Amino acid sequence: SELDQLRQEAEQLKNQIRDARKACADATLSQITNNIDPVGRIQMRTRRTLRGHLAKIYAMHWGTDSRLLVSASQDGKLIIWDSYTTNKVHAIPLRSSWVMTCAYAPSGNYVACGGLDNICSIYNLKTREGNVRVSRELAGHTGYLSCCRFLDDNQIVTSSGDTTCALWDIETGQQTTTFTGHTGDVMSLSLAPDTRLFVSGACDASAKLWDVREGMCRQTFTGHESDINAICFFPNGNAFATGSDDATCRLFDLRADQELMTYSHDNIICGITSVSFSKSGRLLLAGYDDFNCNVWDALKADRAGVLAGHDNRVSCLGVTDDGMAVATGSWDSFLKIWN
Amino acid sequence: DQRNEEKAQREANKKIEKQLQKDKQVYRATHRLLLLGAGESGKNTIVKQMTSGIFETKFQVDKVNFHMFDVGAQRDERRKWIQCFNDVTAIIFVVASNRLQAALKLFDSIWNNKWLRDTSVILFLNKQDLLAEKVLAGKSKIEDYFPEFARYTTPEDATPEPGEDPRVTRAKYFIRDEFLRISTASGDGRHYCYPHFTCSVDTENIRRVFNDCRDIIQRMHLRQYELL
Amino acid sequence: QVQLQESGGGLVQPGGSLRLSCAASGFTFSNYKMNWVRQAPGKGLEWVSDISQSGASISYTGSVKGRFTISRDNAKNTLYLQMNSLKPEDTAVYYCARCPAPFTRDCFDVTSTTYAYRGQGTQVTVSS
Amino acid sequence: XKCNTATCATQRLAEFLRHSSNNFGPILPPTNVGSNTP
Amino acid sequence: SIAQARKLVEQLKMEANIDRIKVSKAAADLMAYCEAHAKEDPLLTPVPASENPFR
Amino acid sequence: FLYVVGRKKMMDAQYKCYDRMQQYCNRTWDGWLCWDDTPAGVLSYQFCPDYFPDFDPSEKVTKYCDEKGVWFKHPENNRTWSNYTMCNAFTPEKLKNAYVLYYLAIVGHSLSIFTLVISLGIFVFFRSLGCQRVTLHKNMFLTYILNSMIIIIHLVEVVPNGELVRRDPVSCKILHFFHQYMMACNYFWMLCEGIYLHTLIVVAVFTEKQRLRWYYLLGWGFPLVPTTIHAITRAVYFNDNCWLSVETHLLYIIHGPVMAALVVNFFFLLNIVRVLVTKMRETHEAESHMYLKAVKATMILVPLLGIQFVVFPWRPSNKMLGKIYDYVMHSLIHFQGFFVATIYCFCNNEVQTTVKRQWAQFKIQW
């Protein structure tokens, strides 16, 4: 009796939320930007090709200087590349070879990694002796680590396979905040420009907005049909983009609290593994399982370009802070810079 | 100036490349195996005979290194992390003896996944003695869960062990054919299945994998020259 | 929003018949492979039957091979399970489940304890 | 023995040509079997 | 469980008491932001040679 | 030099036959090749004594006893004579066959060079195709190209120009030495590739990574040892003009061991085939498919390992059978590079996929 009426109340609340969202929807994004000049054909070329990794690449992260980047490979390796000269800076072996994510600190003095070992390893790059050693090993997650992003040199936000997210405090080893509410595996997280909020997508075809300080879920966004594998914030921070296994990408607005635009095509069947925005947010870059990457016009939902240089699936891609180039990794153990 | 910094960068790069060459030489000489069980399959005893989300075990057979990984502290939803094992040497799938239907469903999902379609599976039908004693007792039957066992006939290619009654031989060969049908329903020469009648305490099991992976490697070589 | 609603079931005498229905919304039902599973009291979730996207590929478990019949209709975005010659061993909560990804041959995690793409099943009791 | 293997075939084809188109000797005279000869 | 349903109801109630704006206003804001920063996007308008570090 | 060696051979045969005779038509010693005593024999069959470049051992020399008196009498000179009119060996038919074979060799070598240049360019340009076997294939293609170019140069320039051979420069001997070295390196690279395939398939398949320094040493370094020794012998005992003479056993210093190496390759092939058969009996493949597959594998492995060189050691004496044998063996020898390039570079699935992907990307860019 209690469960049935609780479910009825939850259904009524969902009906009210959907009614409010429908009432707030007066016009679509397609007709608003129908009068603007289309972006036209765009063509990017491969300028650099990073070689040296033995196994498939799982994650990459650009540094704040838009020059140094970090790459993670399941051979058990973290490699720091200088994209300008292609020279390798640091080669860090990993205790666990099943790495799935890597992070670069904004200050550039630390790096992070994690994977099937359920342990977030933080390595110091500016050691006195010059060698790279593990600075911290945060433990407590009961699932595989999927993503991690630094807030500062002493705080980090991580996502795990235990359907929960964590906010840790370095130099103590204890997670100060726990975010719960997801039912599926959390696959990716994206920090807002003000760092106050962050969006995380899970395997329940839903994304959730979490406030870092207080630590509750503020908004929940649905609309995808399969697991969400990628997420990225808009440059202005009032919206975000999600890529899922349903071969579609979606744009959600924080203030509108509903989906704004869907990017898909009939010939695209494979899912989306990575996604990111450009400097101005006009172009949306998404990595696909068909060994190719698609650049879409975010305002008009029109495909603007195709980046095809990888012989295997694209697992990760990122855009520099200045927006001068885009780095794409793939399972073929190669990283490519496109400009 | 630019010259000194670039020279230091070249020196660090060449040292890194030398270390990576040594690491690649080490890495290409070892085989990685993914150990998976359907539940209460007894693979823990096999591990004993040779928190943290994964466990590692390294063993040498005939001067050949093998690194087997067992998943621990991971939720029952395997559809995401299993993709990390798409380039291992083989997946050792242990099946006890309706848990059998669930094991068959897991094997069908592993067999038909896009990332694992070129990965071979070594099947270990563990607890042969338990199945033999259950068949001899007769209290538990397979026809209630698998009616097709009523019309099943022992294949002419069967090689039963001496002293084994025909009933247990028929039951174990029917269980093997249950997985064989799924394995042969797909996988047109890209991957193969190696069923084995094993117990949790046999010392030959380590040999068995050694006899399977080698075969796989040979087939892979035969795929490189377009001979098979 | 992916939504699955189960209808039908109840208390039936032994040897009776029943028709369970599964209504799907929030996704393209025509390109997903569907499953019927059950959870018996004091027991874990058990897979019962499955049907492909077009309905050509149909499979059942051994215990209901000759008794249950699974079907789908894409026009009304619906799924049906016809159960005949019911026995007290069939008393369980039945769930209608969807595969995590479309255009995908295999189907993972449908029998897991927590699964997002699974609705609230209906109770079927067989007793006199 | 003369090289009669298959690997020596091409050379055996060249020499037979070289002795035919123009003999190494400048006179390049042929043999006589018609009369006053063994 | 009952506790899970109660927590879900509480979360739904918390999420249902927020203020939302019109979709057209958000679309206009996004368009204005895209237009304002269009000239500063190297990937949008291609940079001439000898000006990028990846030439 | 050929005249002197021919006169010496004739004198040696004269001494040998005189000794044999010293140790029914009365036997008489003919000026070139003597005749064994026969009891009024008819149509004596003996091989041509090939003391001259014009003659060949293929034909036979006749004669009759008691047909008119005791021996055949020449009507013009009224003296004894023996029939050597079938030895000319320069009839228009033989010349036409030789010209056809030479033109076929030129065409095959040119096509092989043209295909192998493209194959080497494809392998070098596409770095994603890089592998341990790919380097060996690149070396094999390079030695194919070098051997074919040297053969074409020899056949187009050296053969028709006889005054250059008459002058006998050191450059001609250097070119011949380079030709022999290149052919030895080519055969030993076939041997190296066969050894690599046997190691990958049959014995010690676990160790995929092995040092290639020994392969380079056996491929290029080893053929130096025999050839120069042969040259030394040709510098000491048989100093012919441009060293262009196959009528010597010293060539077996080079062609002797090489064939043996090819023989080893043959054995390797058998083992591989056996393994393949085993690989198809464990999987219970259809017997017709098993034969189709085994035959296809053998057919595609024959050109790579140089099996044909040990498959045709016998030349049938029949005119039609001999012509067919000559055509088939010349086609197999001269088109080996083209067949290898087509099979291992143009029919490769990975290479085809990479080429298609690159072409699609290029067409997308422009």
PDB file of N, CA and C in Angstrom, chain C residues 57-122:
ATOM      1  N   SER C  57      13.199 -13.798 -34.655  1.00  0.00           N
ATOM      2  CA  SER C  57      13.978 -14.570 -33.695  1.00  0.00           C
ATOM      3  C   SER C  57      13.260 -14.560 -32.352  1.00  0.00           C
ATOM      4  N   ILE C  58      12.824 -15.737 -31.908  1.00  0.00           N
ATOM      5  CA  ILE C  58      12.089 -15.899 -30.660  1.00  0.00           C
ATOM      6  C   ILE C  58      12.712 -17.056 -29.892  1.00  0.00           C
ATOM      7  N   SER C  59      12.985 -16.845 -28.605  1.00  0.00           N
ATOM      8  CA  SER C  59      13.543 -17.904 -27.776  1.00  0.00           C
ATOM      9  C   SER C  59      12.882 -17.891 -26.407  1.00  0.00           C
ATOM     10  N   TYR C  60      12.817 -19.071 -25.793  1.00  0.00           N
ATOM     11  CA  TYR C  60      12.246 -19.247 -24.466  1.00  0.00           C
ATOM     12  C   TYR C  60      13.222 -20.030 -23.599  1.00  0.00           C
ATOM     13  N   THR C  61      12.973 -20.008 -22.293  1.00  0.00           N
ATOM     14  CA  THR C  61      13.695 -20.895 -21.398  1.00  0.00           C
ATOM     15  C   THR C  61      13.077 -22.291 -21.440  1.00  0.00           C
ATOM     16  N   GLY C  62      13.800 -23.255 -20.872  1.00  0.00           N
ATOM     17  CA  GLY C  62      13.371 -24.642 -20.969  1.00  0.00           C
ATOM     18  C   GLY C  62      12.068 -24.921 -20.244  1.00  0.00           C
ATOM     19  N   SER C  63      11.856 -24.270 -19.098  1.00  0.00           N
ATOM     20  CA  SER C  63      10.692 -24.564 -18.270  1.00  0.00           C
ATOM     21  C   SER C  63       9.378 -24.106 -18.892  1.00  0.00           C
ATOM     22  N   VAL C  64       9.407 -23.147 -19.817  1.00  0.00           N
ATOM     23  CA  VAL C  64       8.186 -22.625 -20.421  1.00  0.00           C
ATOM     24  C   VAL C  64       8.283 -22.711 -21.939  1.00  0.00           C
ATOM     25  N   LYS C  65       9.122 -23.626 -22.431  1.00  0.00           N
ATOM     26  CA  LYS C  65       9.343 -23.745 -23.870  1.00  0.00           C
ATOM     27  C   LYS C  65       8.045 -24.054 -24.608  1.00  0.00           C
ATOM     28  N   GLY C  66       7.302 -25.052 -24.138  1.00  0.00           N
ATOM     29  CA  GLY C  66       6.063 -25.451 -24.769  1.00  0.00           C
ATOM     30  C   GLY C  66       4.804 -24.829 -24.215  1.00  0.00           C
ATOM     31  N   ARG C  67       4.916 -23.865 -23.305  1.00  0.00           N
ATOM     32  CA  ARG C  67       3.756 -23.272 -22.650  1.00  0.00           C
ATOM     33  C   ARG C  67       3.604 -21.780 -22.899  1.00  0.00           C
ATOM     34  N   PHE C  68       4.700 -21.030 -22.930  1.00  0.00           N
ATOM     35  CA  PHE C  68       4.650 -19.583 -23.078  1.00  0.00           C
ATOM     36  C   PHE C  68       4.852 -19.185 -24.536  1.00  0.00           C
ATOM     37  N   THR C  69       4.289 -18.032 -24.895  1.00  0.00           N
ATOM     38  CA  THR C  69       4.420 -17.490 -26.243  1.00  0.00           C
ATOM     39  C   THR C  69       4.635 -15.988 -26.150  1.00  0.00           C
ATOM     40  N   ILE C  70       5.773 -15.515 -26.650  1.00  0.00           N
ATOM     41  CA  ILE C  70       6.107 -14.095 -26.639  1.00  0.00           C
ATOM     42  C   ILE C  70       5.846 -13.515 -28.022  1.00  0.00           C
ATOM     43  N   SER C  71       5.348 -12.280 -28.061  1.00  0.00           N
ATOM     44  CA  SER C  71       5.074 -11.612 -29.325  1.00  0.00           C
ATOM     45  C   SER C  71       5.217 -10.111 -29.132  1.00  0.00           C
ATOM     46  N   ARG C  72       5.378  -9.399 -30.245  1.00  0.00           N
ATOM     47  CA  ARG C  72       5.497  -7.949 -30.216  1.00  0.00           C
ATOM     48  C   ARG C  72       4.712  -7.353 -31.374  1.00  0.00           C
ATOM     49  N   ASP C  73       4.245  -6.120 -31.180  1.00  0.00           N
ATOM     50  CA  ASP C  73       3.567  -5.356 -32.224  1.00  0.00           C
ATOM     51  C   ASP C  73       4.122  -3.938 -32.190  1.00  0.00           C
ATOM     52  N   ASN C  74       4.810  -3.545 -33.264  1.00  0.00           N
ATOM     53  CA  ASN C  74       5.482  -2.251 -33.294  1.00  0.00           C
ATOM     54  C   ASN C  74       4.522  -1.093 -33.541  1.00  0.00           C
ATOM     55  N   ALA C  75       3.372  -1.353 -34.173  1.00  0.00           N
ATOM     56  CA  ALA C  75       2.457  -0.269 -34.520  1.00  0.00           C
ATOM     57  C   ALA C  75       1.933   0.439 -33.276  1.00  0.00           C
ATOM     58  N   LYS C  76       1.529  -0.322 -32.261  1.00  0.00           N
ATOM     59  CA  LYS C  76       1.094   0.242 -30.993  1.00  0.00           C
ATOM     60  C   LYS C  76       2.204   0.248 -29.949  1.00  0.00           C
ATOM     61  N   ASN C  77       3.434  -0.094 -30.344  1.00  0.00           N
ATOM     62  CA  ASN C  77       4.602  -0.028 -29.464  1.00  0.00           C
ATOM     63  C   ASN C  77       4.414  -0.919 -28.237  1.00  0.00           C
ATOM     64  N   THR C  78       4.023  -2.172 -28.474  1.00  0.00           N
ATOM     65  CA  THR C  78       3.578  -3.031 -27.385  1.00  0.00           C
ATOM     66  C   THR C  78       4.162  -4.431 -27.514  1.00  0.00           C
ATOM     67  N   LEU C  79       4.152  -5.144 -26.387  1.00  0.00           N
ATOM     68  CA  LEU C  79       4.651  -6.509 -26.287  1.00  0.00           C
ATOM     69  C   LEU C  79       3.637  -7.354 -25.526  1.00  0.00           C
ATOM     70  N   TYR C  80       3.505  -8.625 -25.909  1.00  0.00           N
ATOM     71  CA  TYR C  80       2.570  -9.543 -25.275  1.00  0.00           C
ATOM     72  C   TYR C  80       3.275 -10.833 -24.879  1.00  0.00           C
ATOM     73  N   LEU C  81       2.805 -11.422 -23.779  1.00  0.00           N
ATOM     74  CA  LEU C  81       3.250 -12.733 -23.317  1.00  0.00           C
ATOM     75  C   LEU C  81       2.016 -13.547 -22.948  1.00  0.00           C
ATOM     76  N   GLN C  82       1.737 -14.592 -23.725  1.00  0.00           N
ATOM     77  CA  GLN C  82       0.617 -15.486 -23.461  1.00  0.00           C
ATOM     78  C   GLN C  82       1.125 -16.703 -22.698  1.00  0.00           C
ATOM     79  N   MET C  83       0.567 -16.934 -21.513  1.00  0.00           N
ATOM     80  CA  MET C  83       0.973 -18.023 -20.637  1.00  0.00           C
ATOM     81  C   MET C  83      -0.170 -19.022 -20.525  1.00  0.00           C
ATOM     82  N   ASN C  84       0.124 -20.292 -20.794  1.00  0.00           N
ATOM     83  CA  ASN C  84      -0.885 -21.342 -20.801  1.00  0.00           C
ATOM     84  C   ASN C  84      -0.446 -22.491 -19.903  1.00  0.00           C
ATOM     85  N   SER C  85      -1.438 -23.230 -19.405  1.00  0.00           N
ATOM     86  CA  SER C  85      -1.228 -24.352 -18.485  1.00  0.00           C
ATOM     87  C   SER C  85      -0.345 -23.937 -17.309  1.00  0.00           C
ATOM     88  N   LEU C  86      -0.813 -22.935 -16.571  1.00  0.00           N
ATOM     89  CA  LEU C  86      -0.046 -22.397 -15.456  1.00  0.00           C
ATOM     90  C   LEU C  86       0.055 -23.407 -14.320  1.00  0.00           C
ATOM     91  N   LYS C  87       1.171 -23.360 -13.609  1.00  0.00           N
ATOM     92  CA  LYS C  87       1.461 -24.215 -12.471  1.00  0.00           C
ATOM     93  C   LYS C  87       1.897 -23.349 -11.301  1.00  0.00           C
ATOM     94  N   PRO C  88       1.778 -23.854 -10.068  1.00  0.00           N
ATOM     95  CA  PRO C  88       2.167 -23.037  -8.903  1.00  0.00           C
ATOM     96  C   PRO C  88       3.619 -22.593  -8.923  1.00  0.00           C
ATOM     97  N   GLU C  89       4.499 -23.309  -9.624  1.00  0.00           N
ATOM     98  CA  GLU C  89       5.892 -22.893  -9.739  1.00  0.00           C
ATOM     99  C   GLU C  89       6.062 -21.609 -10.541  1.00  0.00           C
ATOM    100  N   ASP C  90       5.041 -21.182 -11.280  1.00  0.00           N
ATOM    101  CA  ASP C  90       5.110 -19.977 -12.097  1.00  0.00           C
ATOM    102  C   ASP C  90       4.746 -18.712 -11.330  1.00  0.00           C
ATOM    103  N   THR C  91       4.397 -18.825 -10.049  1.00  0.00           N
ATOM    104  CA  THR C  91       4.049 -17.654  -9.254  1.00  0.00           C
ATOM    105  C   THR C  91       5.283 -16.783  -9.055  1.00  0.00           C
ATOM    106  N   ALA C  92       5.260 -15.579  -9.622  1.00  0.00           N
ATOM    107  CA  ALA C  92       6.418 -14.694  -9.591  1.00  0.00           C
ATOM    108  C   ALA C  92       5.990 -13.308 -10.053  1.00  0.00           C
ATOM    109  N   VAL C  93       6.905 -12.353  -9.912  1.00  0.00           N
ATOM    110  CA  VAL C  93       6.715 -11.011 -10.451  1.00  0.00           C
ATOM    111  C   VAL C  93       7.412 -10.951 -11.804  1.00  0.00           C
ATOM    112  N   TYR C  94       6.655 -10.637 -12.851  1.00  0.00           N
ATOM    113  CA  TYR C  94       7.156 -10.660 -14.219  1.00  0.00           C
ATOM    114  C   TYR C  94       7.487  -9.247 -14.679  1.00  0.00           C
ATOM    115  N   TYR C  95       8.650  -9.093 -15.306  1.00  0.00           N
ATOM    116  CA  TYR C  95       9.144  -7.809 -15.779  1.00  0.00           C
ATOM    117  C   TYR C  95       9.386  -7.859 -17.282  1.00  0.00           C
ATOM    118  N   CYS C  96       9.073  -6.751 -17.947  1.00  0.00           N
ATOM    119  CA  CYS C  96       9.331  -6.562 -19.368  1.00  0.00           C
ATOM    120  C   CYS C  96      10.558  -5.668 -19.519  1.00  0.00           C
ATOM    121  N   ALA C  97      11.603  -6.190 -20.159  1.00  0.00           N
ATOM    122  CA  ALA C  97      12.896  -5.527 -20.214  1.00  0.00           C
ATOM    123  C   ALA C  97      13.303  -5.248 -21.654  1.00  0.00           C
ATOM    124  N   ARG C  98      14.110  -4.204 -21.822  1.00  0.00           N
ATOM    125  CA  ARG C  98      14.612  -3.775 -23.117  1.00  0.00           C
ATOM    126  C   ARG C  98      16.133  -3.841 -23.126  1.00  0.00           C
ATOM    127  N   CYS C  99      16.693  -4.150 -24.294  1.00  0.00           N
ATOM    128  CA  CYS C  99      18.139  -4.191 -24.435  1.00  0.00           C
ATOM    129  C   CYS C  99      18.732  -2.790 -24.279  1.00  0.00           C
ATOM    130  N   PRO C 100      19.936  -2.687 -23.710  1.00  0.00           N
ATOM    131  CA  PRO C 100      20.523  -1.355 -23.478  1.00  0.00           C
ATOM    132  C   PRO C 100      20.755  -0.550 -24.745  1.00  0.00           C
ATOM    133  N   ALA C 101      21.076  -1.195 -25.863  1.00  0.00           N
ATOM    134  CA  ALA C 101      21.411  -0.478 -27.081  1.00  0.00           C
ATOM    135  C   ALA C 101      20.611  -1.013 -28.258  1.00  0.00           C
ATOM    136  N   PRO C 102      20.288  -0.157 -29.225  1.00  0.00           N
ATOM    137  CA  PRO C 102      19.587  -0.612 -30.426  1.00  0.00           C
ATOM    138  C   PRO C 102      20.549  -1.133 -31.487  1.00  0.00           C
ATOM    139  N   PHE C 103      19.980  -1.884 -32.434  1.00  0.00           N
ATOM    140  CA  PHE C 103      20.738  -2.498 -33.526  1.00  0.00           C
ATOM    141  C   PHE C 103      21.884  -3.358 -33.004  1.00  0.00           C
ATOM    142  N   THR C 104      21.670  -4.020 -31.869  1.00  0.00           N
ATOM    143  CA  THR C 104      22.707  -4.784 -31.192  1.00  0.00           C
ATOM    144  C   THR C 104      22.235  -6.221 -31.021  1.00  0.00           C
ATOM    145  N   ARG C 105      23.079  -7.173 -31.431  1.00  0.00           N
ATOM    146  CA  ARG C 105      22.675  -8.577 -31.440  1.00  0.00           C
ATOM    147  C   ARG C 105      22.478  -9.115 -30.027  1.00  0.00           C
ATOM    148  N   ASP C 106      23.452  -8.897 -29.149  1.00  0.00           N
ATOM    149  CA  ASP C 106      23.393  -9.435 -27.799  1.00  0.00           C
ATOM    150  C   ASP C 106      22.612  -8.499 -26.878  1.00  0.00           C
ATOM    151  N   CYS C 107      22.420  -8.944 -25.635  1.00  0.00           N
ATOM    152  CA  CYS C 107      21.625  -8.187 -24.670  1.00  0.00           C
ATOM    153  C   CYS C 107      22.210  -8.444 -23.283  1.00  0.00           C
ATOM    154  N   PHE C 108      22.807  -7.412 -22.695  1.00  0.00           N
ATOM    155  CA  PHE C 108      23.468  -7.525 -21.404  1.00  0.00           C
ATOM    156  C   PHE C 108      22.604  -6.965 -20.280  1.00  0.00           C
ATOM    157  N   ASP C 109      22.798  -7.520 -19.083  1.00  0.00           N
ATOM    158  CA  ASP C 109      22.332  -6.976 -17.810  1.00  0.00           C
ATOM    159  C   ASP C 109      20.817  -6.913 -17.680  1.00  0.00           C
ATOM    160  N   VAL C 110      20.070  -7.669 -18.489  1.00  0.00           N
ATOM    161  CA  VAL C 110      18.618  -7.664 -18.361  1.00  0.00           C
ATOM    162  C   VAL C 110      18.158  -8.348 -17.080  1.00  0.00           C
ATOM    163  N   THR C 111      18.940  -9.292 -16.559  1.00  0.00           N
ATOM    164  CA  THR C 111      18.592 -10.021 -15.348  1.00  0.00           C
ATOM    165  C   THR C 111      19.312  -9.491 -14.115  1.00  0.00           C
ATOM    166  N   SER C 112      19.963  -8.335 -14.220  1.00  0.00           N
ATOM    167  CA  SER C 112      20.676  -7.768 -13.088  1.00  0.00           C
ATOM    168  C   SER C 112      19.696  -7.274 -12.026  1.00  0.00           C
ATOM    169  N   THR C 113      20.208  -7.127 -10.801  1.00  0.00           N
ATOM    170  CA  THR C 113      19.369  -6.674  -9.696  1.00  0.00           C
ATOM    171  C   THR C 113      18.839  -5.266  -9.945  1.00  0.00           C
ATOM    172  N   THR C 114      19.690  -4.373 -10.444  1.00  0.00           N
ATOM    173  CA  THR C 114      19.301  -3.009 -10.778  1.00  0.00           C
ATOM    174  C   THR C 114      19.484  -2.804 -12.274  1.00  0.00           C
ATOM    175  N   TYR C 115      18.394  -2.482 -12.967  1.00  0.00           N
ATOM    176  CA  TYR C 115      18.425  -2.265 -14.406  1.00  0.00           C
ATOM    177  C   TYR C 115      17.496  -1.112 -14.749  1.00  0.00           C
ATOM    178  N   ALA C 116      18.049  -0.081 -15.395  1.00  0.00           N
ATOM    179  CA  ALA C 116      17.276   1.125 -15.672  1.00  0.00           C
ATOM    180  C   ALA C 116      16.144   0.858 -16.657  1.00  0.00           C
ATOM    181  N   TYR C 117      16.407   0.075 -17.699  1.00  0.00           N
ATOM    182  CA  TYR C 117      15.416  -0.170 -18.747  1.00  0.00           C
ATOM    183  C   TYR C 117      14.524  -1.361 -18.410  1.00  0.00           C
ATOM    184  N   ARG C 118      13.936  -1.337 -17.216  1.00  0.00           N
ATOM    185  CA  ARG C 118      13.022  -2.382 -16.775  1.00  0.00           C
ATOM    186  C   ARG C 118      11.907  -1.745 -15.962  1.00  0.00           C
ATOM    187  N   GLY C 119      10.661  -2.061 -16.316  1.00  0.00           N
ATOM    188  CA  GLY C 119       9.511  -1.507 -15.635  1.00  0.00           C
ATOM    189  C   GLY C 119       9.135  -2.293 -14.391  1.00  0.00           C
ATOM    190  N   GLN C 120       8.047  -1.855 -13.763  1.00  0.00           N
ATOM    191  CA  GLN C 120       7.521  -2.503 -12.567  1.00  0.00           C
ATOM    192  C   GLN C 120       6.659  -3.684 -12.999  1.00  0.00           C
ATOM    193  N   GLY C 121       7.133  -4.894 -12.727  1.00  0.00           N
ATOM    194  CA  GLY C 121       6.464  -6.092 -13.183  1.00  0.00           C
ATOM    195  C   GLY C 121       5.146  -6.337 -12.469  1.00  0.00           C
ATOM    196  N   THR C 122       4.396  -7.293 -13.008  1.00  0.00           N
ATOM    197  CA  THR C 122       3.089  -7.664 -12.487  1.00  0.00           C
ATOM    198  C   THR C 122       3.182  -9.002 -11.767  1.00  0.00           C
TER     199      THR C 122
END
